[PDB]
Amino acid sequence: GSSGSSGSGEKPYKCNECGKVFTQNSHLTNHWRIHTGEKPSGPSSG
Ligand SMILES: [Zn+2]
């Protein structure tokens, strides 16, 4: 079978706005920037 459970494997830091994953904190917090404005009105990139 296949186990699809996150937590241990994935990193403790994960963007709760799109679904990204980073190794450090400063990286995650920073990323959010792109989410907070910056021409958020357009074609979804995903
Ligand atoms: Zn994000």
Length of the chain, in residues: 46
In three-state secondary structure terms, 21 is strand
- Ligand 1 centroid to residue 10 C-alpha, Å: 15
What's the CA-to-centroid distance between 42 and ligand 1, angstroms? Answer: 16
Q: Is 14 helix (H, G, I), strand (E, B) or coil?
A: strand
- Tell me the torsion sign for CA atoms 17, 20, 22, 26: negative
User: What is the Cα–Cα distance from 20 to 22, expressed in whole angstroms?
Assistant: 7
Residue among 1, 28, 27, 23 at smallest CA distance from 10: 23
CA distance 21 to 5: 15
Method by which the model was determined? NMR
**All structural domains of the chain with their residue ranges:** 1-46
For 14, phi and psi rounded to 5 degrees? Answer: -145, 130
- Distance of alpha carbon 1 from its chain centroid, rounded? 27
Question: 39 C-alpha vs ligand 1 centroid, how far in Å?
Answer: 14
How far, CA to CA in Å, does 24 sit from each of 12, 21, 27, 33, 36? 9, 9, 6, 15, 20
